Amino acid sequence: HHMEQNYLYKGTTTLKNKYGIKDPNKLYERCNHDVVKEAVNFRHEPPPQNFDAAYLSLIHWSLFHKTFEWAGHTRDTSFTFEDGTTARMPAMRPKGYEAPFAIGPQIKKELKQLEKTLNQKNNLKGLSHQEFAENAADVFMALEHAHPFRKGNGRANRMFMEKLGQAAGHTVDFSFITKGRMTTACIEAMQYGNSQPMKDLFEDITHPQK
Ligand SMILES: Nc1ncnc2c1ncn2[C@@H]1O[C@H](COP(=O)(O)OP(=O)(O)NP(=O)(O)O)[C@@H](O)[C@H]1O
């Protein structure tokens, strides 16, 4: 259990962070604030040639480097903090639920499989509204199950989808999507094998580019 605990301040359930904030709720507030600002900037970046694991990590670094020392690094790789301790978390399972995220070697395997799919589908270009929304839901569910980071997966994955939409000719807009709406879609897909809420979600947030 040792490696996993090194993500957290001794005795707390709070992730080590660059603010040195020990209060979990204050960390949440400060992090969110910084991520929203960095997200505004990242929306202006030109699309990458390849939508791959490296790009997801670039997104994660861009959103979270002010918050976490390990921003951009996935939880299957050992990370050594400035404080000298080393953390890793190959297995994560949402509390109170049976189905885990990708475990250990599965994280890389799943990301590689998603890379191949996107390359084969030419990054979802040349698709109608309906076709893009359908395929984008599948991509997002794959990202969500992979859950490659210790924290910040939702925000990195959602930005990945915004940028994919930008490249593909579709605006993907999460601005009116509550935490509850998103959580319900994610849980139904991953815990219960029901993709309809996620399909509906991507239909609701996908629009022609203006
Ligand atoms: N029981 C669950 N099963 C599957 N996915 C879940 C479950 N609970 C939460 N999730 C999803 O896990 C993601 C959150 O991962 P996390 O590493 O906490 O990302 P985050 O960016 O830090 N937080 P957030 O802004 O709320 O998405 C969200 O997409 C949730 O909908």
Numbering used by the authors: 0 to 209
Tell me, in the authors' exact words, what the paper reports.
Proteins containing a FIC domain catalyze AMPylation and other post-translational modifications (PTMs). Among these, Bartonella effector proteins (Beps) comprise a particularly diverse ensemble of FIC domains that subvert various host cellular functions. The FIC fold comprises eight conserved α-helices and encompasses a characteristic active site loop between helices α4 and α5 that forms most of the catalytic center and the substrate binding pocket. Additionally, FIC domains generally contain a β-hairpin between helix α2 and helix α3 that is referred to as the “flap” and mediates docking of a target segment in extended conformation via β-strand augmentation.
The structures of Bhe_BepA, Bcl_Bep1, Bqu_BepC, and Btr_BepC exhibit all features defining a FIC AMP transferase as described in the first chapter and elsewhere. Indeed, the complex of Btr_BepC with AMPPNP demonstrates competent tri-phosphate nucleotide binding as has been observed for, e.g., the inhibition-relieved VbhT/VbhA(E24G) complex. However, BepC proteins are special in that they have a lysine instead of a Mg2+-coordinating aspartate/glutamate in the FIC motif. The structure shows that this lysine (K150) is interacting directly with the α-phosphate. Thus, BepC proteins appear to require no divalent cation for substrate binding, in contrast to all FIC AMP transferases characterized so far. The structure also verifies that a cysteine (C185) can substitute the ribose binding serine (last position of the active site motif used in Figure 6B). For BepC, despite its canonical signature motif, no catalytic activity has yet been found, but its BepFIC domain mediates protein–protein interaction with the RhoGEF GEF-H1, thereby activating RhoA signaling. Btr_BepC FIC with AMPPNP crystals were grown from a solution of 10% w/v PEG 8000, 20% v/v ethylene glycol, 0.1 M MES/imdazole, pH 6.5, and 0.02 M each of sodium L-glutamate, DL-alanine, glycine, DL-lysine, and DL-serine. Data for Btr_BepC FIC with AMPPNP were collected on a Rigaku Saturn 944 + detector at a wavelength of 1.5418 Å with our in-house source (Rigaku FR-E + Superbright rotating anode).
